[PDB]
């Protein structure tokens, strides 16, 4: 149920759920990225 983004330039799981303004846990950074999916995607080696 909780969601896990990773912070910019420190890359520690930032663990935000509420509608609070975006923020790192220790950094001053305001920028965060989503983590990759766990579903598999197949490719054609052409």
């Amino acid at each position: 149920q909780p969601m896990i983004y990773i912070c910019g330039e420190c890359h520690t799981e930032n663990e935000i759920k509420s509608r609070d303004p975006i923020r790192c846990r220790e950094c001053g950074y305001r920028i965060m990225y989503k983590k990759r999916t766990k579903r598999l995607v197949v490719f054609d080696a052409r």
């Binding site: 305001r30 920028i31 965060m32 990225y33 983590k35 995607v41």
Partner: protein, 88 residues
Amino acid sequence: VMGPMLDAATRKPIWRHEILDADGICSPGEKVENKQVLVNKSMPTVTQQPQYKDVPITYKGATDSYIEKVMISSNAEDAFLIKMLLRQ
């Protein structure tokens, strides 16, 4: 933003919401094709509890794309901001 609409008959999200995540936004690594939604945004129709109307952000293009990275950030005016990078 609201999460995917699940079919009770399947316990899996409808086709147009297939790519979404629990938070209502698309998942890096996955494969988007035409007229599937990328963010499930909703706005206030009331401008007693506020009612809400659907107005998603959809992908429209010829071929499929893969999703490279998804960014979330904010201004000081409380306005959230999403950015996404698609690849072919």
